[PDB]
Design a protein around this ligand. Structure first.
Ligand SMILES: *[C@@H]1O[C@H](CO)[C@@H](O)[C@H](O)[C@H]1NC(C)=O
Ligand SMILES: *[C@@H]1O[C@H](CO)[C@@H](O)[C@H](O)[C@H]1NC(C)=O
Lengths: 49, 50
């Protein structure tokens, strides 16, 4: 099974013949929040999506 | 266009690096890997310039 982007998205089970969906996981660029360094050393961490 | 380009041969022996790794030894798969990486870098550069 393929989508518009020529990428597989659903594969039928060769064992018991069922339709199974697949989906990629865990995408994101780590970002860090800080109020500068002069007056603090405590930061906040953000994960993208 | 980028996604479609991703699955090109780029003058190599196959379009999936998983097959290339399992087909032969690393000394004879590094050439194909290098060709793939050059092609994909070219495509990415063109996309970003556009
Ligand atoms: C797959 O093999 C199992 C084990 O015998 C069987 O129960 C099942 O019906 C089989 N499914 C098929 C042949 O589609
Ligand atoms: C940090 O803040 C203090 C308090 O105003 C100031 O005196 C100092 O110049 C600041 N240093 C920097 C590097 O911003």
């Amino acid at each position: 099974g393929r989508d518009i982007d020529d990428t597989t998205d659903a594969v039928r089970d060769p064992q018991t013949l069922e339709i199974l969906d697949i989906t990629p996981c865990s995408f994101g660029g780590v970002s860090v929040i800080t109020p500068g360094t002069n007056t603090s050393n405590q930061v906040a961490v953000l994960y993208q999506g | 266009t980028l996604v479609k380009q991703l699955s090109s041969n780029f003058g190599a022996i196959s379009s999936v690096l998983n097959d290339i790794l399992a087909r032969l030894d690393p000394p004879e798969a590094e050439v194909q890997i290098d060709r793939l990486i050059t092609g994909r870098l070219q495509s990415l550069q063109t996309y970003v310039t556009q």
